[PDB]
């Protein structure tokens, strides 16, 4: 009687949704056709006899990815008319997907959301995935969040946004729409998790020893993180954690809800079994700055609160004996007004392996969600990139001619300045 | 209330006596409570030497050595083993005579008075601060944050409660108003 | 006659009860199907204390299970001895509290509590002669620490003359699993002192320390901590269910262990406890039991009892033994430790003997002592509370549901006043 | 009544006790499970001397085992009769002393000794009428020679009127197993003379000499030396546990063998001792026992007793025999050896008869003589000490833990003064 | 509850660590996979179910040896992320591994050391292995020792360094870094053992009768010596010795802690059983100058203290009877201020044989650790070699250009002169 609905918008969102939906189907024993040859209820729904239907909706204005989905092996799984598709792409223009073509599509998505919600009885909250540096992704994510915040109100929404890397970039105009989308979801999303690609590339290179990774390898790690986060809702555990038990433990103030994640262990089968993978060493590896899932240095800032999930055969006393060691270290310092900052969850189900993938099978794993003061650097560098081109008003004509006003750029800049001032104000000791 | 000069001194001396009586390491098994009560009202040689040591008298000169004190103790003690309060006073006077024996010009009374000034018996706080144990814990098989935490509770003080006090009267008035409004709602819905 | 009903709330309380009732059923020879299969006549004479009688000859506990989420009670039903509980007594909500005290005490806990109070009233009005209630809950969670404490006040308002027990687990700063523990601990301690007739604090850190040092087992789990807590819980009411030399109900302990009405926070311990490999070496004698009973490491709390002086103490011996030895040993443990016993109340140790030992053991002892050393726990809890509150961290979650900072200030002031006036008697002299 | 408790420290003392308690249990017919299976009525009349009574009818020794490392007590528990010892009496540290006297007496031994003193006080306060304590320890080790001697002073300070026994193994220069033996031997002898009421020196070299020459067994081991020491230990208190013609407790020996309070260092010996092949040849008669008793090679010390004159002597005969023969033989052994007996104290031999012989033997004798020949051991110990100290070799280990050279100088001076004043009476004439 | 951590740095260190870790796994019955098909706790740790993880860490900047380790049969044994590896080798340059590339790696090693130490509860001390005549080995060993001496303080560290042979050498620049590393570990290591290769080559040639030995044969003998040294911590023995019981017995003064070792017997199965291998003959062979494990002549100097370990079925009396014979001989003379200089340890477990190795199975063995005045010759010859090239400042530019100052060479020379003067000052009689 506990449910959650995941929203996938944009090319990156759909490509990570595919990645998480192989993993969930594999973890619950459901074949790609949707047929089994009481834990499924969190992500799926029973049709009365036979197949299961995911509680997910796919959105995009550009039809190529959806058409690829509707012809692959998973054509029989998803309901045919929840893969909403458009005709014309926003083409990396934020104003397009927020004012011009997204408005005519958003009504169908909201109707689908209502039709899925009326089925659930114990709706925990929503999940949303969107790559920020694109037109349709950021614009439609903003519009959907704004509609949901007023249609439903206090229901919790979680956002797994992928911000651009510090120096590596695929587009040339992504700072503009990244800043605008951050403006939009700052006052509209309860949790936002950092996911830039460069850090995960470094993780793959160093640990998985892959020298030529593709997007699928990144999306599989993200899917594993999602599964670790939501395992506690569908498996028995000695110390459970619910989604609603987050803003009471990781969010000191309503404005501050951007945090960065990490995962451990990450190791290949060729050298995994030569070492014992004790809980102490994995919880040490999870706190290593080089294993952050976002390219930010935690040594440059304080910690505010750490929520970290275990799964497997871990015993609570071993967890406490390792939290003490971390509190001992002099290179990791917490904020003054937080004496204890750890929330611990323990689950029994070990992580599942996907055949043909990178990760091996292990009995212990740890996933941490940590809120730290050091996150302000990404905001500062994105702001610096934005200012350089906004000084000469470059690329603005592509946005003014799509219905957006001239002054809309300035207030996003003011909100980022306010956020940066707030992060500095919080981190000073009393 | 008040005490006599020898007794105030006597009161402070009795407090020292009662403290050192309780420090005795009693050897033996399965005592009677009468024996325990007796031993709490007498000082043994070890506790008397401990007293002289803590007051910085023991081994200070040739007349107050461990052997000389043992001979004096056996000579003046009850049953040659124990001092009651009266024999403890007599022993302190004898120790004072021995301790100042080289000062020929002092009377025995002045030697005792000089010892009572030396131990600071007239100042109960300084006298009591010189009391030291032997040993106990409270039976508990024993072995970064150890340093103590003086939780100074915030005074919900005359200035601070005042608003809070005013607030309690306001909250009682609001509860009385809510009860009257519930009674008036029950009366107006009646 | 003089029976009590069981009420538990939250996940921690439900897990404690799931082992407490197993221990009671094993003690009385009740099979998991509710059918008596015991050996001794005494096993049935006073079964009305905890069990009711239904048609068909089976027995049903008079327990009431409440939580704001259905998962824990849906899980405890599938465990051993889970069928004994009457399905009608299960009451739950569909939302949960998310470790937020305000939600579990003002908004959500207020509307639901009417249904559970209905069944509580049904259970109490019916029983032959009420003795009282016993409550198991955790102070580290939102729904538990809110709904349980509000239910305490509601029960006290209707039954002012009955006795009330609470077994409360307080969050230790060593093993911290939730970041918002100080807030709902401090808020709960404020209400708990005003209504509970007896309170018994239990700490997970002390349980881990005991399991690692005395039993010396490699991998402690929640099942072992629950088993120790259950044995301690059963030891208190043993003489009320079995004959003995000096019967002593709960009210007699209440008279003899509480000098002043606001000093009713005890810490407990159970003896004997020996490792598997050393269970053959040791010989069970009264001196061996009493030396382990007063051992500092044997207390179920991290509070160090030689850092203060006992106001009073109690012991509940089990098995057939001579009273003269018990009295002389109690006198000896009080003559050799006169420095740790307050001097203006002579003969401050209470003893009781029950002729029925636990199943599998020939002698056992339950220790309940009221000591001044408990101040250290409230000191550290208030220290963390005031470290976190001065910056108003995580305050908006509580203030968004009708609560204000004034109730935080009053709670802090009352808790500090309790801390001060509890140690006031430590320095008191005659 | 008039019972004593057992306290042992260090590895050597623990190994001595592991055989002493086996010998006592075999003498009293106690099985390794604590159950009496004896044959004679007298085996139970005075069992309260060494054994306590617990529920279930089993017996437990009142022994206290202490060491600074856990290995030796973890090993003695697995040996025969290892289950008799109460697990509560085992006290140990986690560091050890490393044969350094300073560490075992100032830094580490000072903090730990409170716990062992607690159980020592528990044992002594309880017992019917205390007779005293007996101590087994080695002077060749750090933790033993430090903690045991400091415990001697602590016990003496609390029980000044009780009697105190010490069985001390001093390091001989022939069989040396530790290079720092002279330092902790000299430091320990300084403290031992001030507090011990009786001291009995035992040397491994003399035990090897006895085993090789009298028993003529090919391969001596520590088990044989321990067995001889255990038989000698048991022989002293035999008449206190059994009836006899002339009972003589430890205090009576203390009165009759110590002329001056500082001369209480005895050397002992046990008779009869015969080889396996010659046990049928010999006939056990009082002359045969007394001729072997005064034999120089039979002494448990390498000190040669015909290099000095006996101040006094004692003999504890066992078995049923005529007193007239014992007295006439004692007179004859004193008339034929008038040159080796001091002349200003006439009739300086004490005799006692106990009617209960050792199990398996019809007659036995324990000899305790105070002789002036013991000066040679202190002479050689001080010679090695002053040979090593003049260069300040190995001094930094001791001086790094708060000790200074002044305490070495005082110890050397006091030991030399003891040596001088012990021989002062050898040349004294009437 | 007693533990020890071994550190392996450099190619020689890793290659001797492999040698000792086959032997330990074989001696405790653990298969190469780490699975058994309570003595293991000294070197290993239990993971809860199944495999054991060594308490060892492997360090090197050059990846070839670690990669060889991670692909051999022992790939499953070691934890994958405690085999710290670099990218660029120091190339025999000491300044590189102390100032340039070692600093960036040392932090990870220290983090691993902390993570291993928090698991141990009774940490006895550290072991370290490093070949001195190399850049990374000497430099990283120096840096690690310097960091550990301040992070932990009084914990004991033991160094099994391999100094270059008198005339046989593999490099041309090894005197420079040997002298610098001796400077570094002179004031930072508690024990240093001499291990030059030429002496062990001669031992193999003379006894094992191998005319073409490789490094593995040398490393197996070193591993056997290590096992003999640490046997007393994990096996029952009549006369135990701990690591902390060394500086009190072998180290007369804080500066003097370099000693040389020997082992006996060393014999092949083809002619081992033809002779009885009595304890006397093996203890005679151990003191033969030709069987020293370092190429130094003990006949050229005095002895200071001898600590020598036995294992097998040896009886203490036979040990004493052989120590007497050695004291008798006129060719072995001890220093004047040391009357007794022997510390003896006896253990019961016979040495274990490695299949396919050189040594045969025997029931008795002896390992001696002896501190002698003759060790000054190696210092003198290394100093003479250093001076020849330092006169013309040859090869100095390879060190000045790696951040080291010009004057750093002179002070190492002054410290060696001070050490040589100290060794002469100690050896003169009073
Ligand atoms: N992690 C991850 N990021 C992706 C992936 N695909 C695209 N991105 C990121 O998405 C950003 C651009 O947005 P896209 O998702 O590609 O396109 P869009 O969101 O659909 O917006 P449009 O361009 O209007 O179609 C790029 O900067 C990429 O970094 C992916 O498969 N994995
Ligand atoms: N006993 C022994 N000595 C070795 C072994 N391997 C190398 N050595 C010695 O080590 C010295 C040089 O140091 P290495 O260990 O080889 O190299 P390193 O310590 O890693 O230093 P780098 O050259 O910078 O890599 C040589 O002079 C050898 O005598 C070995 O397997 N056994
Ligand atoms: N003894 C015991 N304690 C538990 C168990 N499960 C959780 N806890 C403790 O309960 C605390 C969390 O309480 P929580 O589950 O949030 O209570 P709730 O909010 O009422 O559901 C943790 O700090 C744990 O130490 C259990 O099975 N046994
Ligand atoms: N009789 C006997 N003597 C022993 C035994 N074990 C050790 N010793 C002696 O004890 C001496 C060493 O004492 P040690 O073990 O260091 O004492 P510790 O420091 O208190 O542990 C050696 O010289 C041995 O002669 C034993 O089993 N029996
Ligand atoms: Mg696109
Ligand atoms: Mg190399």
From TrEMBL, chain B:
Q: What is the name of the protein in this document?
A: Uncharacterized protein
Q: Report which part of the complete sequence is shown.
A: 330 to 525 of 742
